[PDB]
Amino acid sequence: ASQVRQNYHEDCEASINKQINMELYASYVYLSMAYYFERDDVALPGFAKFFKESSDEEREHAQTFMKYQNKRGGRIVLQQIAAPSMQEWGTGLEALQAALDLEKQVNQSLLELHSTASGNNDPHLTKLLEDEYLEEQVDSIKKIGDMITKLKRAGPHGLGEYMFDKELN
């Protein structure tokens, strides 16, 4: 084993590698959305900026897990990153609804990782998940939920979508 490895279960190591792939996938989905909203026939620059920054954040989430893997003496194994589920994302509201669903899927995976870490009595890893991931995920889900409600109020189509887009820009 690695000279640093201590109290680090192989199941947690493997689950971290799977989570790295999921974070990279989420980054790719948000990158797709970002440039969809810069199409000349879409032109929603607030949504584009929101999803560009979300894509950057998920790439950083993946990197933080890669750093963690190395810190504990596990070994990073990278797999193919799936194509985003769509090439075109529809309205601003439909993209936010897809984002909410994705964030909740990621949250479920993080909670399953926490259960794996708890069951293997790894408090360093439950700590990482609670402080660096679970809090960010709940905050993101509440923010996107708020955004869906505000957009449904303002629009969700036409002038209201145009005006809501400005609050993101």
User: Which 42-61 positions form the footprint of Fe ion (CB under 5 A)?
Assistant: 58, 61
Annotate each residue in 116-155 with x if it binds a second copy (CB under 8 A) or - if it does not, as one string.
--x--x-xx-xx-xxx--xx--xx-xx--xxxxxx--xxx
Residue number with CB closer to a second copy (11 or 79) = 79
113 residue type, one letter: L
User: Which 21-40 positions form the footprint of a second copy (CB under 8 A)?
Assistant: 28, 31-32, 35-36, 38-40
Q: Which of 7, 22, 30, 98 binds a second copy (CB under 8 A)?
A: 7
User: Which one of Fe ion, Ni ion, a second copy, none is in contact with 18 (Cβ closer than 5 to 8 A by kind)?
Assistant: none
If one counts every other C-beta atom within 10 angstroms of the C-beta of residue 127, the result is 11
Residue 105 assigned ligand-binding role: no
Would you count residue 82 as binding a second copy (CB under 8 A)?
yes
Would you count residue 14 as binding a second copy (CB under 8 A)?
no
81 contact partners, CB below 8 Å, separation of at least 6: 21, 24, 25, 28
> CA separation (Å) from 31 to 28, 39, 53, 116, 137?
5, 13, 9, 30, 18
Local structure of 56: helix, strand or coil: helix
Would you count residue 106 as binding a second copy (CB under 8 A)?
no
User: Which one of a second copy, Fe ion, Ni ion, none is in contact with 126 (Cβ closer than 5 to 8 A by kind)?
Assistant: a second copy
Q: Which residue carries 């929603």 as its tokens?
A: 44
Copy the structure tokens of residue 51.
């999803």
Annotate each residue in 82-111 with x if it binds Fe ion (CB under 5 A) or - if it does not, as one string.
------------------------------
User: How many helices (H) and strands (E) are present in the chain, helices listed first?
Assistant: 6, 0
Copy the structure tokens of residue 79.
């797999």
